[PDB]
């Protein structure tokens, strides 16, 4: 959570950091506001499980339970209301870099940053987050297939390995990650309690 900036320094580094923070805030606000024989097939809906998962997430306090159950390990198994078992995964880190280093010093009168690599690191992280939020913005909330930004290679491999299926299916699907990525889906989900969560839908080959 970021609220406002008060320091009015002259050095260019402060100006760059303030501009990047403003871009971050604008992206967060935008994402907040975003909240032959062919006629014998059927019009059955494509994305339905993700809608149910998001609706369960929108219920009272489930996101708080998920956040409180993922404080020590980045990967765990959490159970929602009613009955369901869904994998949860945490990516990136913004609860330590921006809340412990930049916020306590910007909210002052005479801020000054005597370094240059922090700008590069902050711009890289903000570029990643802004790319994610822009790709959600352009496609009106539904994207297909999932780009490299939402799911990296290592994370996808870990998710496939942790998927509760047999061994032959894992062997067949881990060698053709392009195809399984092509047929997946992504749904942008509830925003609240300073935590952003969305749903990724991966196919489960059966035959």
């Amino acid at each position: 959570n970021i609220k406002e900036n008060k320091c009015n320094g002259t050095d260019a580094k402060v100006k760059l950091i303030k501009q990047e923070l403003d871009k971050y805030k604008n992206a967060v606000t935008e994402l907040q506001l975003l909240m032959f024989l062919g006629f014998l097939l059927g019009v059955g809906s494509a994305i339905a499980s993700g809608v149910a998962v998001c609706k369960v997430l929108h219920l009272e306090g489930e996101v708080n339970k998920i956040k409180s159950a993922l404080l020590s390990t980045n990967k765990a198994v959490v159970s929602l209301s009613n009955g369901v078992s869904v994998l949860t995964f945490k990516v990136l880190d913004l609860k330590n870099y921006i809340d412990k280093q930049l916020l306590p010093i910007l909210n002052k009168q005479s801020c000054s940053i005597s370094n240059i690599e922090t700008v590069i690191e902050f711009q890289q992280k903000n570029n990643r987050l802004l790319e994610i939020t822009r790709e959600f913005s352009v496609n009106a909330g539904v994207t297909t297939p999932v780009s490299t930004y939402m799911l990296t290679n290592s994370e996808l491999l870990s998710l496939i390995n942790d998927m509760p299926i047999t061994n032959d299916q894992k062997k067949l699907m881990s060698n053709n990650v392009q195809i399984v990525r092509q047929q997946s889906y992504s749904i942008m989900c509830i925003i609240k309690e300073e935590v952003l969560a969305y749903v990724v839908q991966l196919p489960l080959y059966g035959v």
Partner: antibody
Amino acid sequence: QEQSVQSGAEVKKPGASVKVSCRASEFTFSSDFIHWVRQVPGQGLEWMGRITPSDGTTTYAQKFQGRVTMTRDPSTGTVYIELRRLKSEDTAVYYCVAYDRVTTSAGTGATDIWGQGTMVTVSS
Amino acid sequence: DIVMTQSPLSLPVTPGEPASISCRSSQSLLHGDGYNYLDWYLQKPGRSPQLLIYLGSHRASGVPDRFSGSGSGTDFTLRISRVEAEDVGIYYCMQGLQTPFTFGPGTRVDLK
């Protein structure tokens, strides 16, 4: 950066007690310390003491130990300082200042605001 | 406590030439994690003191781009890039490491 926030001038007599009040709600900036600085005309500055507005922890100097008392009134967030037995030589000017500084891995923040200052004199 | 000295105790200045004032300290003022804890204060005749330099070699709001600080350890220098006719007054040297805070005697700067 004078903010023009203090009490008025004070004229007293030896053997009595003097009271100086500074209100810390018009500094326009949040502060973590309210250090008091005294200055006798014709000389330099000299530290007097400090109190934390959050709780009221007091820290004085060795020379002024056992004579000055600082208190905080949370009705308007004001600080009061009491001096006892002004055995002359205390004719000076008192300032209440906001003084905070924080350091991190990359970047330092500071906030320093001085006050208008009051004049306290003792005479027969 | 900690005892401070300044040099010189009198320094007339010309409107267009630079100037430098040195603060010399007792046992090192250098903190741990980083950065010094010394400050340079300015005072015009009659008004209230205004901060000039904080934490060694940084600048606060205002203070147009002709004041600078330098030094590491026990000696520090305040340098004026190009003085003007509005810098007459008294300069003070302050510490922030322990809390027997002790201002310096004060250097007087007047127009020549």
